[PDB]
């Protein structure tokens, strides 16, 4: 799941699609953080 750069929309990505926010058309997409747990020693 990637999230649109200029508006918040999320979509799965299909291989070979020019990356485009389907909804708005700008072409910058950012991956998203799942809930997975990470341990950092302090």
């Amino acid at each position: 799941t990637y999230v649109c750069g200029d508006c918040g929309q999320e979509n799965t990505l299909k291989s070979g699609d020019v990356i485009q926010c389907r909804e708005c058309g700008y072409r910058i997409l950012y991956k998203k953080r799942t809930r997975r747990v990470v341990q950092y020693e302090a």
Binding site: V38, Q39, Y40, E41
Partner: protein
């Protein structure tokens, strides 16, 4: 025993309670050290 990609815990040692992931030989979640330990020193 275990399998590739499992999340185990370092039971006894200087590095205790750390969670780590078993590359093949475990690797820690956020530090770059590849340690190798026997089964007795690893827990779910």
């Amino acid at each position: 025993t275990y399998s590739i990609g499992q999340k185990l815990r370092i039971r006894v040692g200087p590095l205790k309670g750390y969670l780590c992931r078993v590359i093949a030989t475990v690797k820690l979640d956020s530090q770059h050290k590849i340690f190798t330990v026997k089964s007795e020193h690893l827990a779910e």
